[PDB]
Design a binder for this molecule. Sequence first.
Ligand SMILES: [Mg+2]
Ligand SMILES: [Mg+2]
Ligand SMILES: [Mg+2]
Lengths: 100, 98, 206, 79, 127, 114, 151
Amino acid sequence: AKQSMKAREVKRVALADKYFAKRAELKAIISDVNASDEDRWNAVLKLQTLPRDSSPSRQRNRCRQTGRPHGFLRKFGLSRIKVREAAMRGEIPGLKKASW
Amino acid sequence: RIRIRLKAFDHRLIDQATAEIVETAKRTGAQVRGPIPLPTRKERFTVLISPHVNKDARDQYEIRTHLRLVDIVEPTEKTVDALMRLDLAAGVDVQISL
Amino acid sequence: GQKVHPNGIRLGIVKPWNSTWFANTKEFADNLDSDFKVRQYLTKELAKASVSRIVIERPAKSIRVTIHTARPGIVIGKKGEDVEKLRKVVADIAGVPAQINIAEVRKPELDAKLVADSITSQLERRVMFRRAMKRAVQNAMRLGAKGIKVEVSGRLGGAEIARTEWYREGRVPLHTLRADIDYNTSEAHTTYGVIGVKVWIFKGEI
Amino acid sequence: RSLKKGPFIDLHLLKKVEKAVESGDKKPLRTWSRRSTIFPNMIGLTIAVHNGRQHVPVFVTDEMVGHKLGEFAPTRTYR
Amino acid sequence: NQYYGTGRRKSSAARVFIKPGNGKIVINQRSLEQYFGRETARMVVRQPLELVDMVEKLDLYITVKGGGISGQAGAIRHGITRALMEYDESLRSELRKAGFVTRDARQVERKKVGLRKARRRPQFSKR
Amino acid sequence: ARIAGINIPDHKHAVIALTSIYGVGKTRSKAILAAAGIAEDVKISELSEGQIDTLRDEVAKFVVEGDLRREISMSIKRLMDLGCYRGLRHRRGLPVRGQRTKTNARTRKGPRKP
Amino acid sequence: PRRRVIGQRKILPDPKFGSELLAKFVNILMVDGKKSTAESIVYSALETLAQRSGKSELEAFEVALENVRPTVEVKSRRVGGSTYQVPVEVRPVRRNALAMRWIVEAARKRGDKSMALRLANELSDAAENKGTAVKKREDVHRMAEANKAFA
RNA sequence: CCGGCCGGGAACUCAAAGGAGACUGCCAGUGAUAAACUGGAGGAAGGUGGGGAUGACGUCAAGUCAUCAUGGCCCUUACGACCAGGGCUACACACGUGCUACAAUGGCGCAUACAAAGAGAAGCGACCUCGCGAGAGCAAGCGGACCUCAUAAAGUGCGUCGUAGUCCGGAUUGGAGUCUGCAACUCGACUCCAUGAAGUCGGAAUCGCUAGUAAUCGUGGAUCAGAAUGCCACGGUGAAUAC
Ligand SMILES: [Mg+2]
Ligand SMILES: [Mg+2]
Ligand SMILES: [Mg+2]
């Protein structure tokens, strides 16, 4: 919930998909079975300048409103104790409680 | 020619969403094929209602998404002219695929 | 958590939905955040105009926002300038075309949320909470209610400890899964502390 | 173990020794890139391996061939 | 001529067909001893037939699937009870006394929250 | 019966004696009997010495007892030479196969002393 | 539980030749839910008994069934606190399961060859009274001979 | 071209809905003819027939102000803010859950039979190619009862092993690797080769369970770039008592 944490997710997501996350021709095409030329280093040369703010592997992939690393689920965008309070309040399309 | 594949939540909603498709296509639309049950997926999982404590407290939430086929077989023009820009029984999803 | 929300188990059975639209899990959360933030902005914009309830629908990305009010005279304003202004901000925050529709309630003593807003305006003025509850329950029972269960909890009246108080007048079936009851939750944060309310009203059986 | 094609060398670890292979490095080096390994070029160094409270000066013999700096750093104090 | 035997024994769909004239028993285009003549439930596929007539009066054509070997071998034991209806009364009142005609509605219980199996509680400590 | 000089794998099948031989395990025996042209359905007490010397010649291509522990010790001396964590741990006589050490390594760390 | 007083289920007879005793005989030894191999090794062990006894299987054990089956067990009557033996009559409704239980406990013994070879030899050992489940009968007879006329 | 692959049927397996039928519906009886219950045919289905969400005033002022909330207090060129690196996996030492075990109702090899529930578009990937395997290229196809993840396993037949820690069993390290994401050792997983213990079915004490349950043997999901025996979920096989 920390201001700095919730802004730290923002400062990462504003640029990750704005940068090498899509600017990825130097990601996989360079890293192949091609010549053992400078390419093997040229891969790391760009990444040494690149921040670890921008990499698909980096971000926690959590909720947005909370700022909490846990409770988030991939399909929703919200943490557990908020998404359930909206769920059984009704604000999830077609989501209800059944049994077997 | 119009393979109609509609997907919706409720069986008492998709029935009243298919009623209009299957009614308009007989008065105009030349002997559509028919509706098939087309079994469905319900997305059954157990989501953590858990607060900081008491893991043993759980929730078993689902979303029942119904699946149905129509497959208007003939390439009749009045079919598309009756099925240009209509959406009924909001809470569903319909499409017109040739 | 022994008592579940006595509508979350009755949602897709007898009671209307509140986020009524079909889609797929690639823009779903983007729809969800846009719905939540704009719903809270509209309840921060129309609270003094009494919003009993708000319903969200997304048909073919021409969404429908229904706002059930008791005082629409100040909602529309001058021939709808306020609503035509509101149609802009919702579409700004949501990125989708919006069709906004006001709905009406005649007697505002039919919504548990609309009376809980009254309680929230009541107990933030250093007023007698019994004079609020015992009065609203009789004002509701004289017009009619086969069951009402109104609970106030917390710092009520300067208890300085955890205390719950309930007024039950009538048949309140919080277990029978055939009936229809209205219920909503509200809090009022006075200088002492927060005061939580739980208002159950059983009117419909089918 | 590590990569199939190209051992991972950092650019701050690589280059500082590249042009000093010509000179002798004269000194320990403030290495904050402990995640890379050693190649013939870096043997003979007095490098300062990152270990937190300080940076340990470690001599690099020719036997430190296929090993990384972060491994012989005293993070396991244990008395 | 042709008479159908139904069945749903233990999530195992039984789809049987019976003809008069012979005593061959083919399981999904495979024979008796080819599949389970010496295996689990090797004879309850005949006990319906061996209650009255099996060897050469009535020949069978079975197609049972959707489970385990034992479930497929019992799907037929229950399918023949529904297949023997050309003498419905004399074939149904004869076997209801010994059973073999009930569905045996037995479903494998699902994983229940907390319960580490269908019924097993997680282990305690007490202290 | 005599292979490797010291080991007597009597009454062991052709490849079982080689899996039980000092130096190699499960698949190298299969590889040896495939490179030598022998089946693995009979004990060692039936094959004559005309082929046992050939098995001993064929197994002379891998690392054997005398160099097995000595290559292991060359690596361990590299550990006593470098100073890395697996030299530090190995120089304290500690169990042998991975990473976890705090709560459960008791068999090869011995029973509790006090 | 404290409330209900129901009994056991119906026992499925064997499809080869109907024997409730044999069915239980297998289902007491049953382990782990893998009954295919158990059936592979028990009926194979009993058609091999068919020659060991000279006659069929239902009568192969009836000459020894009695030998396993005693007249007494123990149930402690408490007149202030006790934990030692007090003899009582054993119930025949489950004395069959008791007899098929102790002889499979003994069949796990004599272990040099596989199961099918040894449990039938144990059946012969109860035929000629050379089994340990046969001595269990005298052991409970001794656990009854001592304290008579208790309650 | 014995692949429903091609016409064809829309019987059928099955499938999504609307209903249906289970109901003490009838009968014998100790008993207050009551109530009901042991119970009998009928009965696809015997007593709430399956099972589940459902927690009644509340209680320990139980836990939670580090899900969130918001008074009261305090700090605020610092208790705020930022970077690299380590830690949580450090370990004489207790205990608490579970897989592997502590072999022959078993181990190794060819052979070979059938699931249900799931998931899949900045994601899965048939097929083909290289390899013992891990896995790397080419990459049509599916936002899906059609294309795929993905070949179910114990099973069934059969050979051998035949009592020694022995073809049981495999770990806390060697050596060479394989993928992931800048990045694999302090700190990821996986495959192969090499070594091979403990333990020979157990003391106090104590835990799970009334059926298709226990026991169980595989599968998938989540979390996710990666990262479980575990969590949650699918189904296969299949007991025991209830005096
Ligand atoms: Mg150690
Ligand atoms: Mg406490
Ligand atoms: Mg217990």
